[PDB]
Nucleic acid binder design. Structure first.
Ligand SMILES: [Mg+2]
Ligand SMILES: [Mg+2]
Ligand SMILES: [Mg+2]
Ligand SMILES: [Mg+2]
Ligand SMILES: [Mg+2]
Ligand SMILES: [Mg+2]
Ligand SMILES: [Mg+2]
Ligand SMILES: [Mg+2]
Ligand SMILES: [Mg+2]
Ligand SMILES: [Mg+2]
Ligand SMILES: [Mg+2]
Ligand SMILES: [Mg+2]
Ligand SMILES: [Mg+2]
Ligand SMILES: [Mg+2]
Ligand SMILES: [Mg+2]
Ligand SMILES: [Mg+2]
Ligand SMILES: [Mg+2]
Ligand SMILES: [Mg+2]
Ligand SMILES: [Mg+2]
Ligand SMILES: [Mg+2]
Ligand SMILES: [Mg+2]
Ligand SMILES: [Mg+2]
Ligand SMILES: [Mg+2]
Ligand SMILES: [Mg+2]
Ligand SMILES: [Mg+2]
Ligand SMILES: [Mg+2]
Ligand SMILES: [Mg+2]
Ligand SMILES: [Mg+2]
Ligand SMILES: [Mg+2]
Ligand SMILES: [Mg+2]
Ligand SMILES: [Mg+2]
Ligand SMILES: [Mg+2]
Ligand SMILES: [Mg+2]
Ligand SMILES: [Mg+2]
Ligand SMILES: [Mg+2]
Ligand SMILES: [Mg+2]
Ligand SMILES: [Mg+2]
Ligand SMILES: [Mg+2]
Lengths: 68, 56, 138, 52, 153, 176
RNA sequence: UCCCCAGCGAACCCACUGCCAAGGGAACGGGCUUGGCGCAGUCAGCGGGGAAAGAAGACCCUGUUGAGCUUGACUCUAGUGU
RNA sequence: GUGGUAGGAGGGCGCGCCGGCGCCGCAGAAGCGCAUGCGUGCGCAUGCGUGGAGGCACCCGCGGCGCAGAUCUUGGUGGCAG
RNA sequence: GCAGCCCGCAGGGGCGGCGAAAGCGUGAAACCACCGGGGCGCCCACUUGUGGGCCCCGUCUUGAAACACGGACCAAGGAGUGCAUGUGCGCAGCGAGUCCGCUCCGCGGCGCAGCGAAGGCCAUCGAGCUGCGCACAUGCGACCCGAUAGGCAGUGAACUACGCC
RNA sequence: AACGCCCCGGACAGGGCGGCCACAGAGGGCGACAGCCCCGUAGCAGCGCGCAGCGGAGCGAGUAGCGCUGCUUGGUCAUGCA
RNA sequence: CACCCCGGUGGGGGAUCCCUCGGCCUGCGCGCCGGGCAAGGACGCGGACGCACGCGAUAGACGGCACGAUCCUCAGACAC
């Protein structure tokens, strides 16, 4: 099938609403605001994103630890 | 960002990122075959490879 | 097909080579076929047309006329044959420019060393036919 | 070489094989009259209103 | 040859004349055209001589906003009239050209009546005027293409 | 909207039409649609609906899963409307007659080396003439890698895995 | 000067524009509703109206947009001194 | 069974070019103008005129693929205004 | 592809001339001249001039005919794309495997099983891999156009400021 | 290498008929669309001349490293650099 | 009468379509400046020569070699 743009020719506000809009970056760029305004996105879908777990191994070697 | 997805690790923030396209890839292959043939013709009896050991 | 990668089949480069041909190449591009009576003697298919060449017109308005070549003009690629003319308003008769591909040479001029140039193409054609005869023999 | 999901050719013709044809229940082929909604025709289908 | 605007029904009995890119005011020469149609060929001369002598005027009807009134425009049931001497002079040379074309065709120029006049806009000849505050505005002439056709009665 | 039966069950239509333009698969789907329109048998109605299903809605069967089935329903014709795959955990399988869409080449060899026979879904009414001793099976629909990540991993008692591309130690784990 | 003429000859501006009264309406209509009128569409005056034209309000507020500037702001820093 | 903004979905119309496949054209192609017809509609087909060398249909594939607006851009032209 | 004849000081005009034609291809629209026809701007109805219905579109807005903003007209141009990585769905090949395209030849990746920070534990167990397509998320100029700013590197005292000769 | 006749037309490269060449039917020109009119296209061609002698365990400092500092790096009680 | 609308003819303008010795992209090849005066510039150089392009007081083809009959606006040049 074709892309969605080929059906949105003719309609103002291509698919993004008149009152809303397609603005540049509302909410911020990337995954910022994970503790402020996208906290609901991180409490729901990535609750283990923030913080530290466990003992760091500086340069884990894959071939030495290979044991399938 | 909006939905449930893996967190994005896309590293195109630097405007200095280059791209190495591979349009020379079929052409380099025919150049590479031609040089190997010309090496074999330069050393006609001698093998084109060295004798190399078997190592673990 | 053309299997030589180093020559163009490009239309743009072939058209630019035709209109910006130099004068040595423009002489070759203004070749004209010989008669069958000339081709039994010389052997080659065509030869570059020259002044004082006898010519029969093969296409166009003057088709079937015979006359001598009185003017060749390499820029605009036009051969002007005697007795292929049109008058101006003031009665002045102008020779009409015919392309060399529309002319067939009846009698080749041989004066200004042209008999050497005809024999050089004739002998190289004869020599190259001998090599291709030996190669197909072997 | 690729394996097809069917063995025979023209598998819709398998419908007329007697192995399938014996298996079938009898379909309803009764062609009904087109219904009418106008009150004179549907009184005329059951003309027993005037009997009382 | 260049075609004329109106239809010629009897080319034996009609004459035509032309001037292209005539350096006249188009709006002035449109208005004097509309008062020259359906006139006898010699009567159109005597009218245009009176325009130059300012005895009769040219009624300005379409291109007329701001034109001052005159008593001579009462003849044409208007008030706005003018005396476009240059367009009157261009038409005199054309009507004189109609008379010589009539005698070249052996028709009586006293019998010809001007049937059609088409005054077309010519391309604009550009010019500049210097203005206040360092601005440059166009100062263009608006020439005209004129066609006349006269038929005998 | 669904069809009822004498056994008070419903078999829904599924897709109105299959999206696959496999001409032979839609020949199979149109065939069983024609049988199901003139039959009260629910197995034909379930096969007709499952033939139009997507690849994700037709999860595959191993021969080890059909082997454990064959102890539960011995001597029957096992019908799967999926691809039957092989288990290299199991060197040989019981003898069983399996009617499926596709068989992998390894699965087809173990069934035949057991003495059993593989058949396609158009051969069903020759293998079982009155459609007798036919046992129709589905694979596990939720045994798919996408079902680990459905839902939200940060809900109250959710066992949803977090969406991550990493397999390292610094990947997101489930907080249970 | 204007005004009238010969010749020359722009720009601003321009959704579209018969004119009123009241009403309704985004609460001050040229268009709607209901009434009152006027219409040969020309010349000159004129500044009531077009909430006239100028100019993405300079006032005010908002912006997680600034800049100039100040200091008891925060973090630094040339300089002086040890 | 039939309203519909924001919005989502489906099926088509249209454009440049592609791989094919049916064809057409100096006895006049595209384009254009005016007509007639078809079409719910996007649009399509024909006639006549012009034009003077290419083009059409369908199936496929690629996409810088459809405009009334952006104080849009560029060009042209009006009214204003003799 | 001309200047013959008549007219004009001339530019030129008219009868002509060359050529298949065009006469520096085609020649749309805005717009204009003249001529011809007709007078709702649109929709409906019919016996065509009457009646009935219609405020200016776009837009933001709770609400626009608005005394809200943009729009004189017309042509042409003109705005969700590309890549990367995901996810979901559909399709496709094979399937405990799968992936040609780095290369002259992947035991490289993912999957066949997970848990824990780790020591350690290890199943009662599970279809995937790859491609194609769309939607969507993110990074990128990121639908198009738009700041005031900030920086880096340069150029100017012909205006003007001051000082010197 | 290999093309003639007829029709239409201002002109044949068009149409019709009949051939021909092809290791050449890529492309361009020629008064319309040319394998055979032209330019082209496919196709076809190699070799020679040189190389000699006399030490071989020589070894690396304002460095490495450490301390401090500044920069840098994925480099983490320091990766690099100063 | 003006005004408006529709058509015809003529204007007006340059859209459309067709064309394209141009661009763009990719691949390959080359990869060679300079006191032996470079890059760049200035000024000059044609019978009639402004621009462009060419050129350097040997100044709009000087020599060698190859080519072989035209160049052209006029005048002329040309198998020496
Ligand atoms: Mg919007
Ligand atoms: Mg949307
Ligand atoms: Mg809001
Ligand atoms: Mg906070
Ligand atoms: Mg006045
Ligand atoms: Mg000034
Ligand atoms: Mg005046
Ligand atoms: Mg009022
Ligand atoms: Mg009223
Ligand atoms: Mg007034
Ligand atoms: Mg006022
Ligand atoms: Mg503002
Ligand atoms: Mg805020
Ligand atoms: Mg609806
Ligand atoms: Mg909508
Ligand atoms: Mg087309
Ligand atoms: Mg079409
Ligand atoms: Mg676009
Ligand atoms: Mg537009
Ligand atoms: Mg719009
Ligand atoms: Mg104007
Ligand atoms: Mg033209
Ligand atoms: Mg709203
Ligand atoms: Mg409001
Ligand atoms: Mg509105
Ligand atoms: Mg108001
Ligand atoms: Mg405005
Ligand atoms: Mg457009
Ligand atoms: Mg995006
Ligand atoms: Mg900007
Ligand atoms: Mg800053
Ligand atoms: Mg600076
Ligand atoms: Mg040191
Ligand atoms: Mg009109
Ligand atoms: Mg242009
Ligand atoms: Mg390049
Ligand atoms: Mg020098
Ligand atoms: Mg010389």
């Amino acid at each position: 099938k074709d892309k969605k743009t080929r059906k949105l020719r003719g309609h103002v506000s291509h698919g993004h609403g008149r009152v809303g809009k397609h603005r540049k970056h509302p909410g911020g760029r990337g995954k910022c605001g994970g503790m402020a305004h996208r906290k609901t996105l991180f409490m729901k879908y990535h609750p283990d994103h923030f913080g530290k777990r466990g003992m760091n191994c500086t340069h884990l070697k894959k071939n030495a630890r290979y044991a399938p | 960002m909006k939905h449930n997805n893996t967190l994005p690790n896309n590293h195109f923030k630097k405007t200095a990122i280059r791209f190495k396209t591979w349009f020379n890839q079929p052409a380099k292959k025919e150049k590479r075959i031609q040089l190997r043939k010309e090496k074999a013709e330069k050393m006609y009896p001698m093998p084109v490879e060295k004798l190399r050991p078997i190592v673990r | 097909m053309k299997f030589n990668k180093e020559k163009t089949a490009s239309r743009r480069k072939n058209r630019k080579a035709h209109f910006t041909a130099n004068s040595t190449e423009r002489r070759i591009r203004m070749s004209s076929p010989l008669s069958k009576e000339l081709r039994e003697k010389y052997g080659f298919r065509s030869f570059p047309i020259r002044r004082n060449d006898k010519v029969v017109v093969m296409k166009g308005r003057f088709k079937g006329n015979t006359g001598t070549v009185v003017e060749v003009r390499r820029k605009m690629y036009k051969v002007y044959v005697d007795s292929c003319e049109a008058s101006k308003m003031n009665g002045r008769k102008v020779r009409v420019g015919i392309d060399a591909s529309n002319l067939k040479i009846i009698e080749l001029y041989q004066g200004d060393g042209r008999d050497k140039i005809l024999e050089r193409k004739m002998n190289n054609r004869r020599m190259q036919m001998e090599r291709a005869a030996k190669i197909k023999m072997e | 070489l690729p394996t097809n999901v069917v063995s025979k050719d023209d598998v819709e013709s398998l419908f007329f094989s007697d192995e399938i044809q014996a298996f079938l229940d009898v379909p309803n082929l009764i062609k009904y009259e087109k219904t009418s909604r106008k009150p004179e025709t549907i009184e005329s289908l059951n003309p027993y209103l005037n009997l009382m | 040859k260049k075609k004329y605007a109106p239809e010629i029904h009897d080319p034996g009995n009609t004459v035509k004349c032309r001037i292209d890119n005539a350096r006249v005011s188009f709006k002035n020469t449109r208005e004097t055209s509309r008062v020259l149609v359906n006139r006898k060929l010699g009567d159109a001369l005597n009218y245009l001589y009176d325009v130059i002598k300012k005895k009769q005027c040219v009624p300005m009807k379409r291109y007329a906003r701001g034109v001052g009134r005159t008593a001579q425009a009462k003849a044409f049931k208007t008030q706005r009239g003018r005396w476009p001497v240059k367009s009157a002079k261009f038409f005199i040379e054309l009507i004189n050209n109609l008379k010589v074309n009539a005698v070249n065709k052996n028709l009586n120029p006293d019998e010809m009546v001007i049937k059609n006049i088409i005054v077309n806009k010519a391309p604009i000849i550009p010019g500049r005027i210097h203005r206040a505050y360092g601005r440059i505005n166009p100062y263009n002439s608006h020439p005209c293409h004129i066609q006349m056709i006269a038929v005998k009665k | 909207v669904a069809t009822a039966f004498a056994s008070k069950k419903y078999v829904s239509r599924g897709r109105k039409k299959l999206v696959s333009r496999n001409i032979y698969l839609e020949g199979l789907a149109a065939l069983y649609e024609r049988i199901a329109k003139s039959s009260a048998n629910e197995i034909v109605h379930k096969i007709a609906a499952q033939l139009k299903m997507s690849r994700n809605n037709r999860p595959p069967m191993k021969v080890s899963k059909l082997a454990n089935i064959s102890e539960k329903y011995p001597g029957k014709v096992y019908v799967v409307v999926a691809k039957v795959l092989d288990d290299n955990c199991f060197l040989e399988v019981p003898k069983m007659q399996i009617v499926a869409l596709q068989f992998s080449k390894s699965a087809k060899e173990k069934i035949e080396k057991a003495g059993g026979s593989t058949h396609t879904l158009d051969q069903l009414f020759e293998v079982a003439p009155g459609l007798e001793n036919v046992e129709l099976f589905r694979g596990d629909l939720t045994a798919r890698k996408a079902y680990k990540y459905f839902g939200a991993p940060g809900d109250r008692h959710s066992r949803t895995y977090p969406k991550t591309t990493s397999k390292g130690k610094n990947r997101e784990k489930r907080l249970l």
